[PDB]
Amino acid sequence: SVMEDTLLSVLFETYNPKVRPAQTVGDKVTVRVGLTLTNLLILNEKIEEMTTNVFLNLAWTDYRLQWDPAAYEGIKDLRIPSSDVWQPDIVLMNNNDGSFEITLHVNVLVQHTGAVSWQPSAIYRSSCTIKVMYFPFDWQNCTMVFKSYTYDTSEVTLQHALDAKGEREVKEIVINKDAFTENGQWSIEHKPSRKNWRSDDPSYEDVTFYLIIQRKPLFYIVYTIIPCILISILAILVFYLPPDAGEKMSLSISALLAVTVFLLLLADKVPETSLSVPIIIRYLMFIMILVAFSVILSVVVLNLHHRSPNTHTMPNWIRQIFIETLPPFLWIQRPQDLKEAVEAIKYIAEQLESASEFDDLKKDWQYVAMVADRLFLYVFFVICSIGTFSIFLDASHNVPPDNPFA
Least distance CB 209 / another protein (angstroms)? 18
Q: Which residues does 54 contact at the CB level (< 8 Å), separation at least 6?
A: 35, 36, 37, 38, 121, 122, 124, 144
- Closer residue to another protein, CB minimum distance, 195 or 306: 306
Eight-class DSSP state of 278: -
Distance of CA 342 to the CA centre of its chain: 84
Least distance CB 211 / another protein (angstroms)? 18
Q: Which residues does 334 contact at the CB level (< 8 Å), separation at least 6?
A: 327, 367
Q: Is 310 left (phi over 0), alpha (psi -120 to 50) or beta?
A: alpha
Decide if 189 contacts 401 (C-beta within 8 A). no
Q: Which residues does 372 contact at the CB level (< 8 Å), separation at least 6?
A: 300, 301, 304, 322
Least distance CB 155 / another protein (angstroms)? 8
Least distance CB 336 / another protein (angstroms)? 10
d(CA 374, CA 327): 9
Least distance CB 402 / another protein (angstroms)? 23
Decide if 233 contacts 380 (C-beta within 8 A). no
Least distance CB 170 / another protein (angstroms)? 15
- Closer residue to another protein, CB minimum distance, 48 or 138: 48
Decide if 48 contacts 129 (C-beta within 8 A). yes
- Closer residue to another protein, CB minimum distance, 349 or 403: 349
- Closer residue to another protein, CB minimum distance, 39 or 159: 39
Question: What single letter denotes the amino acid at residue 112?
Answer: H
Least distance CB 85 / another protein (angstroms)? 12
Least distance CB 169 / another protein (angstroms)? 19
Q: What is the CA radius of gyration of the chain?
A: 39
- Closer residue to another protein, CB minimum distance, 268 or 402: 268
For 268, list phi and psi in degrees, rounded to 5.
-80, 15
- Closer residue to another protein, CB minimum distance, 182 or 405: 182
Q: Which residues does 1 contact at the CB level (< 8 Å), separation at least 6?
A: 73
- Closer residue to another protein, CB minimum distance, 191 or 217: 217
Q: Which residues does 141 contact at the CB level (< 8 Å), separation at least 6?
A: 128, 131, 210, 211, 212, 400
Distance of CA 399 to the CA centre of its chain: 13
Least distance CB 53 / another protein (angstroms)? 8
Neighbours of 99 (CB within 10 A): 14
- Closer residue to another protein, CB minimum distance, 209 or 365: 365
Bridge partners (DSSP) listed for residue 90 = 148
- Closer residue to another protein, CB minimum distance, 336 or 403: 336
- Closer residue to another protein, CB minimum distance, 129 or 403: 129
Least distance CB 33 / another protein (angstroms)? 18
* Of residues 309, 299, 307, 297, the one with CA closest to residue 367: 307
